[PDB]
Paper text:
The presentation of antigenic peptides by major histocompatibility complex class I ([name] I) molecules on the cell surface ensures the detection and elimination of infected or cancerous cells by the adaptive immune system. [name] I complexes are composed of a heavy chain (hc) and the light chain β2-microglobulin (β2m). The chaperone [name] in conjunction with the oxidoreductase [name] is crucial for [name] I assembly and for shaping the epitope repertoire for high immunogenicity. During peptide loading and editing, [name] stabilizes peptide-receptive [name] I heterodimers and catalyzes peptide exchange by accelerating peptide association and dissociation.
Here, we present the 2.7-Å crystal structure of an [name] I–[name]–[name] editing complex assembled by a photo-triggered approach. After photo-cleavage of loaded peptides, we first screened different [name] I allomorphs for complex formation with the [name]–[name] heterodimer by size exclusion chromatography (SEC), resulting in murine H2-Db as the most suited [name] I hc candidate. Utilizing microseed matrix screening, we obtained crystals in space group P22121 with an improved resolution of 2.7 Å and only one complex in the asymmetric unit, enabling us to build an atomic model with good stereochemistry. The concave binding site of the N-terminal domain embeds the α2-1 helix region of [name] I hc like a clamp. On one side of the clamp, a loop comprising residues Glu11-Lys20, referred to as editing loop in the following, sits on top of the F-pocket of the [name] I peptide-binding groove, whereas a β hairpin element contacts the floor of the peptide-binding groove from below. Upon client binding, the intrinsically disordered editing loop of the client-free state of tapasin4,29 rigidifies as evidenced by a clear electron density at the 1.5 σ level for most loop residues. Furthermore, the side chain of Leu18 of the editing loop, which was shown to be relevant for [name] I surface expression, compensates in the peptide-free [name] I F-pocket for the lack of a C-terminal hydrophobic side chain of the antigenic peptide and presumably assists in groove widening. Upon client binding, the β hairpin of [name] is shifted downwards to accommodate the α2-1 region of [name] I in a similar way as revealed in TAPBPR–[name] I structures. Furthermore, the C-terminal Ig-like domain of [name] swings towards the α3 domain of the [name] I hc and β2m, allowing for an additional interaction interface with a buried surface area of 1724 Å2 (hc: 55%; β2m: 45%).
Numbering used by the authors:
A (entry chain A): 1 to 283, 289 to 380, 399
B (entry chain D): 0 to 99
C (entry chain B): 1 to 18, 22 to 467
D (entry chain C): 1 to 88, 91 to 276
The structure:
């Protein structure tokens, strides 16, 4: 229950460069006046009213005593969607008068939630009782899976839900019953590669670019209420995820001249299995080969060498020259590599003294995995 | 930010025959950012006078270099490529194996 | 030079001083407005000594902007005598705007002061409506001017007092003649048509014009398309161009009329037209004639209700292909054209693929119950259902009265009787009640389905 | 086969009063052919392949002038980005731009992209009309570029000039760019553990680098355990790669290595030989 979320206001500073300025979002609890914030510019202190109740419900579940979420807002002017697949959502060469006035896009992000909301603030801050700027939420889009980790070869279910409360109009209400058609776009951009994975326009059955990589989405409104507000779902289902499908997933809910985007970092992993054998054919001790097989990602692997003492004795970092192999690649996109130890000429008895390699990798527990040479 | 640790391969340009001349390569690639330290090593010591390509650029935003020197492989001599980068807790060493 | 800046404070006052004005209602944020800005300023400068161009920022001036019902930006409306006189829907370019207001600048009805002026006026590519009066002092003349002002956007009006003309085209110094385009004259109708009511009123004139301006088969163009489309109407599309292929344009038009006459004379009711495959290449996508666009005409019909019927045979030069087509239509023996995939080759079970072409053959085969699933290829619910819906087909692969069916509703038009709100939407059309089919709205689980087929299914169901 | 032209620009800020180092390198296929480097005294574009020596002084003048313009653009961009992300030494801003052609030598895809700190910042999508931008800085950039029709300018550049120049460079440098050096392949034998032997299939001397090495057991594909190394440059303009598979000693000849490459009329098939 944050109640107040501190936020950066980002502005195009005279076109010379972007600059951030302190603000805050106050989720209206209802009874009680807002806290005075004389540290804040009243224009950037927003009393947020959310008829849809998606923004406010997102932070009621927020684990009390968790770190504050990162928050950014900026001004934006409504533009039509330039994408072909989304052309039917605005089939006229005019702009709605309902979108008159100022607009803010809020983006809130944390390990548990990433959210984007389109707000309409009043042009001037309320002067009494507290200097605060009243604002209302039009569109909210958010994922409860902002950084999903998926086992190589498993399905990935990327959470997405949204809410919309048609913006107030000067006059000439739609008088059109039913939630209006929207658009949903799922795309991936990662290390210079980008693909439209799925596009859909529920409420307009025109042909959409084919979905890719076995992807589908649960793209729908939740109800058929004749007036609103309305909530919806855009959850993305990507089957049997491979490494090439890792990276940033961008999900955008499109309504006429209004775009709401959230992003997700999909990480693919496969834990490394480790084994230890004498490199040479049962070979000046024989060279030891710590084989680390079929893991992803390739980075993060640390190969530790230890000489484990017998009864009484204990583990010590092993001595002698050590190095690595090159990476070897497999069909599934996983890798294997081998570590190498050349122990020095044994110059002392060491009952129970066994050599072992320990590996660490983000896929593993902190303690890692290890292997001693199989004394077959 | 996305930092990426260098991938390394160390190999001769032609199949090594002992006593015949050849070129020892160290291919370092798929790293970010571009600041990197590479050195070929003969029996522990730095092979000085090693020549490298200029910094190259991949479609994934990663960089790559090829470090090389001419060399005559014997049986006793052992060669390696030593690499350091910000992604690494300590320098990474990859030993030349003429069958790889 | 400049656009006039009108506000809620000085709109009513300055709207009168002109006798028309182009008023652009806008908001500074509208990109359509942003690009219009320099084109509108370019227009204003070139039309400075003719018509004034005004602009109203609606964020500021909400009252005047609502006064004329503005919902979007930019809205451009012509105000003559400070009164709404229709919008401007041409292109948002300086060339477009100055072109249009010029026509609007002149009088509703052009005075023809000589016979030469008269001859010039009727040599137009479009029709002429000409009033013949002894002078300006009749109530008939006043009614003609009233009609002319009312309908000036749709038709060309003129009047004359020239004695030679008044006496050749009327018998009491009060007449209206409609002159159809010269290059369009034919053996199936008259060049001219006279107004024959006894009293002349703006109302009766409009009726007279509407009912007689085009004839049996007009040449549809960008101008008249709105006036022609609306009722059951057949268009034959080809390389119609009266400055290049006149003989060719006449030939096909004559052959259309020749056939049209046969049916019209028999009592059959249908409107006809010809139109350029070039000028209207867009309309072909509604019919599927994008590929078919050569010298030989192509034909398609659009009923007032919305149904479309497309001629499949090639248009024979003798018109017999067009005769058969039209014969099938009036008999009710032509299947309506609809967005469809290629109907597949086998279509064995357990589930029956359903495109719009074979829809009514499968889903509306009466005495045979149909469970129809309207799916989308991208929908996850639709993906979850797929193996359950196929298993349902298998457990019903002996009962032929019960057919399990699916159709990609993103790739195929859904007929009017059915409606797909979201995905998936599943309909069940009874043995005989195919006209009023009802939704499923049950749980999407195999057991829920077969338990539902044990109820609505009129015939007993075969669980396998 | 397919072909491509790509220009990679790169600015790297240096801690202190120093100015960023701007390198701009052009590639055809994976072959560098021009380079500019701010650090080099007398920074101008130099030819990096011998087939570019044809272009006269007016080419290098125009191209060098563009480079110094970009260097200035990158200089201000780096400072701005430094602002928004609140960093103090060394930061990296990258652009990539170019055009892929198919075997028909026709536009198969066009690219205009940026990255800050090795992370995609903003990218022109495949439709050459819309942009992908993750965070709020790039979203703000994307709204500016949409309102200025940046995409239209780049669609026109990439769709016409990019292919035009690529056609010219392909014809002028055909003797090396349309060359097809065939892979010399051979299999090696290495005892491993007990009753096991690693069979390594080599492919040496091959350009282009596009290559597939596959292993079989009685004409059946072996995917699960098969090990590949990345294609690597020999340093003489050619390329190297290998694929390995473990097999029991005595059952070696039941396994075969097939290679696929442009220079091959049909794919090679190999086995281990004493
Ligand atoms: C958006 O749509 C997706 C897909 O429909 C929703 O994911 C689904 O959520 C339901 C729960 O609401 C899951 O049901 C599961 O049932 C088992 C068995 O009773 C239970 O153990 C689980 O805890 C869960 O309740 C379902 O498996 C899951 N995925 C599907 C249907 O493929 C998602 O919740 C929707 N988001 C909304 C509505 O905000």
């Amino acid at each position: 229950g944050p109640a107040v979320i501190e936020c950066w206001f980002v502005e195009d500073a005279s076109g010379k460069g972007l600059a951030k300025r302190p603000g805050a979002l106050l989720l209206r609890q209802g009874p009680g006046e807002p806290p005075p914030r004389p540290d804040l510019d009243p224009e950037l202190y927003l009393s947020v009213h959310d008829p849809a109740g998606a923004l406010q419900a997102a932070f009621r579940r927020y684990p009390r005593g968790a770190p504050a979420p990162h928050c950014e807002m900026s001004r934006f002017v409504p533009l039509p969607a330039s994408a072909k697949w989304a052309s039917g959502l605005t089939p006229a060469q005019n702009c709605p008068r309902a979108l008159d006035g100022a607009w803010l896009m809020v983006s809130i992000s944390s390990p548990v939630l990433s959210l984007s909301s389109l707000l309409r603030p009043q042009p001037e801050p309320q002067q009494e009782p507290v200097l605060i700027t009243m604002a209302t939420v039009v569109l909210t889009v958010l994922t409860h899976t902002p950084a999903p980790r998926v086992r190589l070869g498993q399905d990935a279910l990327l959470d997405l839900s949204f809410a919309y409360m048609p913006p107030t109009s000067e006059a000439a209400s739609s008088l059109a019953p039913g939630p209006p058609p929207f658009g949903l776009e799922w795309r991936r951009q990662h290390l210079g590669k980008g693909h439209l994975l799925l596009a859909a326009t529920p409420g307009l059955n025109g042909q959409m670019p084919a979905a890719q990589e076995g992807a589908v989405a649960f793209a729908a409104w939740d109800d058929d209420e004749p007036w609103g507000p309305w909530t919806g779902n855009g959850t993305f289902w990507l089957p049997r995820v491979q490494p090439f499908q890792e990276g940033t997933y961008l999900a955008t809910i499109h309504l006429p001249y209004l775009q709401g985007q959230v992003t997700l970092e999909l990480a693919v992993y496969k834990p490394p299995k480790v084994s230890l054998m004498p490199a040479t054919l049962a070979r000046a001790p024989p060279e030891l080969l710590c084989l680390v097989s079929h893991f992803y990602p390739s980075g993060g692997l640390e190969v530790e060498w230890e000489l484990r003492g017998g009864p009484g004795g204990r583990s010590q970092k092993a001595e002698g020259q050590r190095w690595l192999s090159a990476l070897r690649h497999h069909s599934d996109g996983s890798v294997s590599l081998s570590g190498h130890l050349q122990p020095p000429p044994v110059t002392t008895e060491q009952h129970g003294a066994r050599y072992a390699c320990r590996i660490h990798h983000p896929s593993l527990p902190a303690s890692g995995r290890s292997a001693e040479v199989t004394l077959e | 930010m996305i930092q990426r640790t260098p991938k390394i391969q160390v190999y001769s340009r032609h199949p090594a025959e002992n006593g015949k001349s050849n070129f020892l390569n160290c291919y370092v690639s798929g790293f970010h950012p571009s600041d990197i330290e590479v050195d070929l090593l003969k029996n522990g010591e730095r092979i000085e006078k090693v020549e490298h390509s200029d910094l190259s650029f991949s479609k994934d935003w990663s960089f790559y270099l090829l470090y090389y020197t001419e060399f005559t492989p014997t049986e006793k001599d052992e060669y390696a490529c030593r690499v350091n980068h910000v992604t690494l807790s300590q320098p990474k060493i990859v030993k030349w194996d003429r069958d790889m | 030079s400049d656009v006039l800046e009108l506000t809620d404070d000085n709109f009513e006052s300055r709207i009168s001083d002109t006798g028309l004005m182009l008023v652009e209602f806008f908001a500074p944020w509208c990109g359509h407005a942003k690009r219009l800005a320099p084109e509108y300023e370019a227009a204003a400068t070139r039309l400075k000594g003719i018509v004034p161009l005004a602009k109203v920022d609606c964020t500021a001036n909400t009252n005047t902007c609502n006064k004329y019902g503005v919902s979007g930006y930019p809205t451009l409306k012509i105000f003559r005598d400070g009164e709404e006189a229709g919008a401007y829907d041409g292109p948002r370019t300086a060339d477009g705007i100055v072109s249009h207001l010029k026509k609007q600048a002149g009088p509703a009805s052009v005075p023809l002061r000589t016979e030469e002026e008269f001859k010039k006026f009727i040599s137009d590519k479009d029709a002429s409506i000409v009033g013949f009066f002894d002078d300006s002092f009749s109530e008939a003349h006043s009614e003609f001017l009233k009609a002319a002002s009312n309908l000036r956007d749709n038709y060309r009006f003129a009047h004359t007092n020239v004695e030679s003309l008044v006496n050749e085209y009327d018998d009491n110094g009060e007449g209206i003649i409609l002159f159809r385009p010269s290059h369009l004259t034919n053996k199936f109708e008259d060049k001219t048509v006279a107004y024959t009511e006894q009293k002349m009123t703006s109302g009766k004139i409009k009726k007279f014009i509407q009912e007689n301006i085009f004839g049996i088969c007009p040449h549809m163009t960008e101008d008249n398309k709105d006036l022609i489309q609306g009722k059951d109407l057949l268009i034959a599309y080809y390389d119609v161009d009266y400055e290049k292929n006149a003989k060719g344009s006449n030939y096909w038009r004559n052959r259309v009329m020749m056939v049209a006459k046969k049916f019209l004379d028999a009592g059959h009711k249908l409107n006809f037209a010809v139109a350029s495959r070039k000028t209207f290449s867009h309309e072909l996508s509604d019919f599927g004639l994008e590929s078919t666009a050569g010298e030989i005409p192509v034909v398609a019909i659009r009923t007032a209700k919305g149904e479309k019927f497309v001629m499949q045979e090639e248009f024979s030069r003798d018109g017999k292909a067009l005769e058969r087509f039209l014969q099938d239509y009036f008999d009710g023996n032509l299947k309506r054209y609809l967005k469809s995939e290629p109907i597949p080759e086998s279509n064995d079970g357990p589930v029956k693929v359903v495109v719009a072409e074979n829809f009514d053959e499968i889903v509306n085969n009466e005495n045979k119950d149909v469970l129809i699933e309207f799916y989308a290829p991208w929908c996850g619910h639709c993906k979850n259902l797929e193996p359950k819906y196929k298993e349902l087909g298998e457990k019903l692969s002996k009962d032929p009265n019960i057919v399990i069916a699916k159709m990609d509703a993103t790739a195929n038009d859904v007929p009017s009787p059915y409606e797909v709100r979201g995905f998936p939407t599943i309909y069940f059309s009874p043995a005989n009640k195919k006209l009023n089919p009802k939704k499923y709205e049950g749980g999407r689980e195999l057991s829920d389905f077969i338990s539902y087929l044990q109820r609505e299914a009129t015939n007993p169901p075969v669980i396998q | 086969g397919p072909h491509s032209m790509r220009y990679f620009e790169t600015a790297v800020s240096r801690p202190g009063l120093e100015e960023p180092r701007y390198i701009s390198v052009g590639y055809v296929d994976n072959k560098e052919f021009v380079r500019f480097d701010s650090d080099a005294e007398n920074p101008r574009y130099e030819p990096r392949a011998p087939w570019m020596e044809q272009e006269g002084p007016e080419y290098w003048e125009r191209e060098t002038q563009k480079a110094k313009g970009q260097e200035q653009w990158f200089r201000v961009s780096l400072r701005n980005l430094l602002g928004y992300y609140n960093q103090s030494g060394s930061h990296t801003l990258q652009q990539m731009s170019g055009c892929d052609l198919g075997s028909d030598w026709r536009l198969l895809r066009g690219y205009l992209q940026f990255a800050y700190e090795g992370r995609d910042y903003i990218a022109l999508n495949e439709d050459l009309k819309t942009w992908t931008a993750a965070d709020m800085a790039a979203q703000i950039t994307r709204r500016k570029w949409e309102q200025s029709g940046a995409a239209e300018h780049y669609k026109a550049y990439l769709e016409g000039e990019c292919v035009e120049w690529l056609h010219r460079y392909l014809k002028n440098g055909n003797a090396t760019l349309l060359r097809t050096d065939s892979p010399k392949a051979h299999v090696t034998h290495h005892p491993r553990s007990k009753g096991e032997v690693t069979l390594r299939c080599w492919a040496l001397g091959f350009y282009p680098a596009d290559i597939t090495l596959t292993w079989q057991l009685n004409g059946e594909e072996l995917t699960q355990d098969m090990e590949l190394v990345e294609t690597r440059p020999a340093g003489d303009g050619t390329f190297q790669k290998w694929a390995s598979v473990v097999v029991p000693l005595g059952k070696e000849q039941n396994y075969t290595c097939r290679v696929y490459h442009e220079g091959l009329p049909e794919p090679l098939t190999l086995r281990w030989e004493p």
